[PDB]
Amino acid sequence: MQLTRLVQVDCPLGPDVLLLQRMEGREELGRLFAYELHLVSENPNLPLEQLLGKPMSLSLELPGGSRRFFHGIVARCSQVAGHGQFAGYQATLRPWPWLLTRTSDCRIFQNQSVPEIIKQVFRNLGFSDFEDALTRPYREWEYCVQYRETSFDFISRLMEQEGIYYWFRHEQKRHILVLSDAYGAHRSPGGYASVPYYPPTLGHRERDHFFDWQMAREVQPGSLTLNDYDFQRPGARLEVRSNIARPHAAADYPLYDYPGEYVQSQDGEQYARNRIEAIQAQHERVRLRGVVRGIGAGHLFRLSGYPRDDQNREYLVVGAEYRVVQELYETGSGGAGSQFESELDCIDASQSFRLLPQTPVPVVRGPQTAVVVGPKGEEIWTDQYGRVKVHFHWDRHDQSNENSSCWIRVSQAWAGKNWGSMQIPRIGQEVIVSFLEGDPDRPIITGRVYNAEQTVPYELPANATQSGMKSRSSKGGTPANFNEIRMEDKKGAEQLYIHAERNQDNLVENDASLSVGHDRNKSIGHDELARIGNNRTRAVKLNDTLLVGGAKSDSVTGTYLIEAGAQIRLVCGKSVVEFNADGTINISGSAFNLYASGNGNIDTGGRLDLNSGGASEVDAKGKGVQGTIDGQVQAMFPPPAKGLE
Amino acid sequence: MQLTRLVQVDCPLGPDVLLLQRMEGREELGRLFAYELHLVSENPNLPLEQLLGKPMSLSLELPGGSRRFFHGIVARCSQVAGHGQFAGYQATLRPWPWLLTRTSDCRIFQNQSVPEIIKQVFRNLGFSDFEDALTRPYREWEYCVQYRETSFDFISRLMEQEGIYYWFRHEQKRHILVLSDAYGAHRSPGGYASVPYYPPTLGHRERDHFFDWQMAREVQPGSLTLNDYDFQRPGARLEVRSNIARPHAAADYPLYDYPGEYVQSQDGEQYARNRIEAIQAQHERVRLRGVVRGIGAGHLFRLSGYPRDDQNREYLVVGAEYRVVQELYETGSGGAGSQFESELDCIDASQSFRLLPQTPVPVVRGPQTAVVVGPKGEEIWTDQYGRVKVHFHWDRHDQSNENSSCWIRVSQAWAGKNWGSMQIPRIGQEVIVSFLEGDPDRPIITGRVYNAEQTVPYELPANATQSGMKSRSSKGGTPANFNEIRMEDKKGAEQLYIHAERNQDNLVENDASLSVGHDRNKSIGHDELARIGNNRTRAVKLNDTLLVGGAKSDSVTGTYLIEAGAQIRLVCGKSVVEFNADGTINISGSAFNLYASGNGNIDTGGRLDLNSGGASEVDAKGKGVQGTIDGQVQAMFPPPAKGLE
């Protein structure tokens, strides 16, 4: 209210009575300021329930001109027990981004740009009151991650990567964060555009102006060429360069970094461009002092007092540092501007501003594990390059699903040009994830692991000596639908076990050579057809045995030679024929029929005639009958399957 | 001894003569102090053999009260050649933990708590003279590692992780390190419990008290929730939170970190609790100045001079900073307390103390290798989750064995719910070990490697084109007991070789389809039994050959049809039967017998009669005899095995 006169402070509560003596306000464009206010006043006790966590309003004035009325947060404050004759305080102010320093997350941003990624940490826990004075387009980040760090640390490092900076466009209603870059972004007052300069010849003057200049210049790197890798296009022209030479000795000495974190070429030519431009602020920076109360970090002006036709040009004030000083009364009615002071760091226009990086790159010093993800009913979610998708064990955003990550590559055992090893991670099983050069924005899947839900395949903690690979039917995980190859290396009990869950189809292009040292037992269920082109040879050192349980059937287009070295019997019920190596043919039946279309000869070298001689019976020796054969076949697999109870 | 009067210093050698003027002693609870002593004295030369590496004794006095007689180590000292009129020195003191700064290890601690882990680096190279004033229980660490770092750096970071701090309980006999936490741990003198406060109205007073207060306060993070991963229980409620709000604006803004390094839940609720509590020291800290010689870092007191009913409460002095000043003689007989000075940082009780972390977390910036271990006679030491145990190549503690590590997980190629790849590392062979997020307390096994003792399986540095897997018999490593699958990819000489060290058991659930393009040679040693359920079909385009070396035996329950398209001979020594497609049956023997139980018919379409006609002999064409057959069988494998000499 309180127009007696003199001191008028509010927004959130500020007494008009409470006087101010000193301040000390540093800042840099793209950094926080701090205003070292030392107060003194009447009040003994005021609360802490807001004022420590909420604004103050300051009012710096160039009357008849660009008032600078201020409004910003209190973040550290104190009182002082030196004088019980009147209060004394301290009060350092810092802007609203500071209140994103004392905070911390682990959060993933996807398919967003790195201006409007920063809008959300603002908006979700804050206002819309910031502004946009950007002009070119930047990169729309596929996958950006605020890793472990503080939201304030997060936003600024990204702004620094992209050349965005900021300042506070000072407003009489609502405070403002100016998201900016380049000439056509900043702005300044009228008639004020050109500010004075004068050596105050009698020590001091009744006037506001400049009384100091210094132009410091260091040598700066000449060119920062960049390079990255691109597996999408593993042949492409990866290199990118930037160059801003000004004409002098020992200038164009080059820099070079690998991972500049780019995918597409032109974007890497921007990044080299932004980081090259920041370092060239240092090339030429200028140092001033004046008693003028209009300018501050971010402001543009033009100097006219220390002249050169085009030395003193446009000037963006980067870091204004200033002071207030007074021990003022209502005495000597009047009293005017009790002394002030300022100091300055400026630049130009065709020579433009960028921010120097200075922050640890979120320090992911080793691998994590993650669940390879997709909720129920699913088992396989890959892509064309054998990529999968994961949730890291830090997600308060979904029941991890196809949105938990970008696609992540897998590190196979053996991988070549459309040939080599492949086992893609199923959904729900855990992996090892590394990070290329340790960047939390660049996962890569580098191995698998077993846990309590995803348990080892075999008998553990027991047959450690077994090894192999066993798969699982997909869509349907029944604890035994699987193809497996398993080598067991336990002495005396070694084995190689191959299990085809359905069908097996072995193809050998030239020759094959099965050698078994003891026995083979082959048992096929329904049918075998074996076919061999040219010749089939079968040699058995001892007894060859064959039981047919149906009709046996043998066709030979030419000749079938049946040779014995002892004896040949064909026994067929009551009709038994027997050929012997001594040469005695024996035949028994129950009748016989002998027919020749043409002729028949029966001859000897002894006697023949007819009747009496051939045995009364040459018996079939028991076996002959069909029932007997049955069981020599059927003594097979008619097995039990009792049933449980 | 030397009671003239005035200055009385000893333990390790201190002259009574040698006067002291200045000191400057800073400390913080949980940090080292340093006392900037500038001496002057008689002596020109005294040695360096101890005094630089050993104590001094100081004596600060509040006579008629709490004397503070001191005893601590010298760690940096100097003399000064300004005056040959009397000596001048410097002497900065620091406590005994400093003498664990200039040291360094790489050592593993197992199944120990993180109070009494610190007891050993103390005790093994030092004393038992420290104390314990702790009250709650902390975590008993399964696996804790002092990685590369200094013993002083090791102990303090752990104390900082667990909320333990310290101070020195000042003793007239033997110096003391107070391992502490919470109210019921600290302590203080009597009647001294309440110390004075007075603005020394005539500049100065004949009295000891306080003459300054300042209560600085910053805004602090509102809550640090934590989260970790737990593969033992990969479904569990990992999250843990902590909260200490005091009522003000912009307060309850949260923090969040992942790996807080916890296994079990409650312990993570402590860690969030300890780290949240440290940051809330900064919330409210108080700054004092007095001329009183009783208090120091760690001391508790209660102020009474600057009052508020409950503003000035209990006060644990966190960091006392103080001064001595004198140029004193035995003149103006008397002379009293030549001036002193102190400064202070205090806290309360229901608002309790914790340490701010500030030390690099032992910087394991990449993987190591390690030997997977167990001394002789052993080959396989795993557990239920397919874990093994390693020694890292830095052990001066055992011939590495089952105690070298905690169990470490392995990174398989393919791992799923009781299905997937397994090859567990044998004892003696080397691996690659990564560290989760780069923490030296969290190894994980991530790959294998060959070395000079553990050599590549094949012909190296030669058949680079071969690949595969070969196992080894376990318990018995004979350079050829093994199951192997080996693909060789050299053009013209390609091969797939499968080797079963004992037994092979292939199971196909539906169908199988072996196609070989050239030849197969199958040779079984002892027996084959092949059985097919339904039908067996065998078709050969050209000559089918069979040699039996024993008894051939063929049974068919129904019909055996034997069909030829040219000719059928059965030759049996001197009895040869020959059926021909034109229809001429030829039979030769040495006798024949023909019998029919019932009837016999012999018919023609030409003539028959008896005798003269059938050949004198239709010869067996040489082959018939048993000796011949032998060699057609036996021309097999009766091989040599000469013998070596």
Place this chain on the structure above:
Amino acid sequence: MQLTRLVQVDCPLGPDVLLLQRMEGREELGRLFAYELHLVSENPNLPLEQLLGKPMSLSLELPGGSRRFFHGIVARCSQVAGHGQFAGYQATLRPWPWLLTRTSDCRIFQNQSVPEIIKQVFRNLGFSDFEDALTRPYREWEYCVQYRETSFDFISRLMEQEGIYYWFRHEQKRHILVLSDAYGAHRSPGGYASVPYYPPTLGHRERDHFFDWQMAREVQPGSLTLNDYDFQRPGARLEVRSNIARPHAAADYPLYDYPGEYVQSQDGEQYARNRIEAIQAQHERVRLRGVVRGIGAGHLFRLSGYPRDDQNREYLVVGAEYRVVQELYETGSGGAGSQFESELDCIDASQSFRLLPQTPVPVVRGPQTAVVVGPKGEEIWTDQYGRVKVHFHWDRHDQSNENSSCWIRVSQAWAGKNWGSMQIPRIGQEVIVSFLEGDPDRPIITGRVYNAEQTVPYELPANATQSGMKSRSSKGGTPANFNEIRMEDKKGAEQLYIHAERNQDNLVENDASLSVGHDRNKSIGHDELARIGNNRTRAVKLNDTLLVGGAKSDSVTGTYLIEAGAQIRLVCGKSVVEFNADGTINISGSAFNLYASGNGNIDTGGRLDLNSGGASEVDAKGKGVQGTIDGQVQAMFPPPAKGLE
């Protein structure tokens, strides 16, 4: 030129007129100096095209003695607008290595030593004007990498690892960088070798000398033992120690680090030696002040004024810090040495100098990928330990080939003593490379990956459910010369497919047991020979069928028993024999011949006689003829192969 008198500065342009007042020159042996020159002069505008990037020449003089005429680079310079009454400037000088600070590379050095590795970054972008005063030999580095960092940062960290340091041997022609170590490397003037010392009793003297001493000493670590791993010799005595004790309390307290980055033993005993020696500079350092204008960092001298027989010995000045001061005219004709000042840090000889390390070790915080390399025509380049060679995606040095790297080990899935897994990376396919403990000089290959040129083997992005391994013919990558094992896990359509690109050779040591649940179809191209030692048993539950397309041939040394349970026919064109289980033998032909060498009997139990009875024809039932059999064989694989158009 300009001998009026007084001030004589040049090389690159320096006016004789332009006066100098202050300087402030700090340095440390093994670091850059900086000379804080504040100028004042006539000139308003001089250019910037060289002078900022090029030298100045200073001339410090001890007339009648060791002149110190200087010549060094300007790197940051400024002017000042305070006085338009005469100019004012600043000008900080720094040596020529500074101009390797504002630069950056990622470059590999191979089979070179770490003195003459530094020669090239010098020589390729600079002069030969440096010098060599080294005496012992150092390590010839197999593989050294300047990773990301600045050339100045690169050279100094390596010099610090090896104990080399430097200073500038000040020359009247051409400036000099002294690459040095040990006593016999430094040097100094004559008669000057011993410099004075005097307390300037009337405040000041007409003379140059010392007027201050201080000998500061801290306690230092007692011994730094080292240890590394050596897979070449995985059993060897890795440990190495160093020790320099001087006699005092709390001294011999040890250090220990693992990776000291050594291969061979003695070299690690040097590294422990160099790093132990640096820390023992701090053990004893000495602080001086004089008005003498001959000495500077690197200079050796001997003090004689503050005596002790052997306290004041040889003195290598490590860091001289000095000053100039004057506001001089040509007035009071004469005027002499307008005042100067210096300050000092010295050491000795038998106690020798080394550099303290202080630089981030190039921070490779995670893995890269790389192409495993060798240009066209090649597919496999390995060594004896299964190592390959890579180019990292940052090479501007070759079309990456056998010189791109040192040999790098691969991380197999399973690796043991001449047994275990092997798939060595082919040339052109990409890998994952980690770095042991994150050192850019120690790659290790830790996994594979697919990209756009090196594509997945199968149907992607489709049969994700298939897995396996497929190789490729080497020397000849035809998109189907390969051995493959492939498990397909899709329900109802599961399969195990084995493909041998040429030959397959399965060996089973004891038994084998093929069980197929449905059918087997085996088709061999040319020949099969099957042989079984003892007994072959074949049982078929239903119909056994055999078609021979050539000559069938069966030999049995003993007996062939042919048994039927229904009937046996042998049909051979027009001659059909039929034996039946009731006992009726039926024979039909077109003639028959029956012969017995000895006797013949034909008998019955009914009637016989001759003629009338046996059938007019028992027909062959159609099948008998050879054409029919043909197609029962030949209905096989006479397939089409139409042709494309």
